[PDB]
Amino acid sequence: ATLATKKATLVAALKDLQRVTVAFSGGIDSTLVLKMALDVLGRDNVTAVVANSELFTDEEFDKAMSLAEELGANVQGTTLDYLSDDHIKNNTPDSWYYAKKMFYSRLNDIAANNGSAAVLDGMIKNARSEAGARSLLQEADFFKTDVRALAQELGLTNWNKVASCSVSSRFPYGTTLTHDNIAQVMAAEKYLRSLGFPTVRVRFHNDIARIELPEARIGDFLVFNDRVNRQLQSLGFRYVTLDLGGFRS
């Protein structure tokens, strides 16, 4: 339960694996996994993969790609067409399962080709598990607090402090995702973020946009009312609203 033996667990596991492929998201957990992998195995035996997809922002992709380079890993992007699976295109409740399946199926193809012994992700002990992958922080009982601590011990400083999550969550179940509406939602959230709100949602309800913000920031939002209204109207919405129960999940 000491942070040191947690680290020791992580190091011996990697030494056993010898060659790894890292599912690199750009967050703190992914950064700790990629950083520790390089520190134990060296740049030649680690491959960082970043997924380019229509369900996450281009900025998240671009900074993650550079973040891996700053960590000293040979990084490789790969593009995933999530909308090619009908459960995702039609935004059923099982969408998450087919997305992760399509994602881990792609990473195992990559690892199988560069000879790697495992795919690595940044699951930590916090209902999620994925058999064809090794979550070494979860496996060594790394808690959110242990990740921040080991990250500071190593000097890792520059990750992406906000998770942002898949855009399918901005559409109701049963709604079909298209390039236009996804682009419509992404343009809206990019705007609200540029005003200073890193945690933001623009939920799609056809002609109504419903914005979720953290309740503690709603007071500060008032100065942007008219600008958000006119801008989100340029993107296709007729009504621009603010959900009074703020940012739920």
Can you give the binding site for Cs ion, defined by CB under 5 A?
58, 130, 135
* Catalytic residue, candidates 112, 165, 183, 208: 165
3-state SS record for 128-193 = CCCCCCECHHHHCCCCHHHHHHHHHHHCCCCCCCCCCCCHHHHCCCCCCCCHHHHHHHHHHHHHHH
> Is 93 an interacting residue with respect to a second copy (CB under 8 A)?
no
Q: Which stretch binds a second copy (CB under 8 A): 8-16, 100-108, 121-129, 143-151?
A: 143-151
The answer to whether 19 contacts a second copy (rule: CB under 8 A) is no
What is the nearest approach in angstroms of Cs ion to the Cβ of residue 182? 8
CB of 38 to a second copy, least distance (A): 11
Q: Which of 42, 128, 148, 173 binds a second copy (CB under 8 A)?
A: 148
Q: Is the Cβ of residue 69 or residue 81 nearer to a second copy in the bound state? A: 69
The yes or no reply on residue 8 touching a second copy (CB under 8 A) is no
Question: Which residue, 82, 74, 80, is CA-closest to 114?
Answer: 74
Cβ atoms of residues 166 and 57 within 8 Å: no
Contact window for a second copy (CB under 8 A) among 8-16, 89-97, 109-117, 191-199: 191-199
Instruction: Enumerate residues 6+ apart whose C-beta is below 8 A from 218.
Output: 242, 246
Strands in 46-52's sheet, in edge-to-edge order, are 74-79, 46-52, 20-23, 118-120
Least distance in angstroms from the C-beta of 81 to a second copy: 27
193 flagged as catalytic: no
Question: Which residues belong to the active site?
Answer: 165
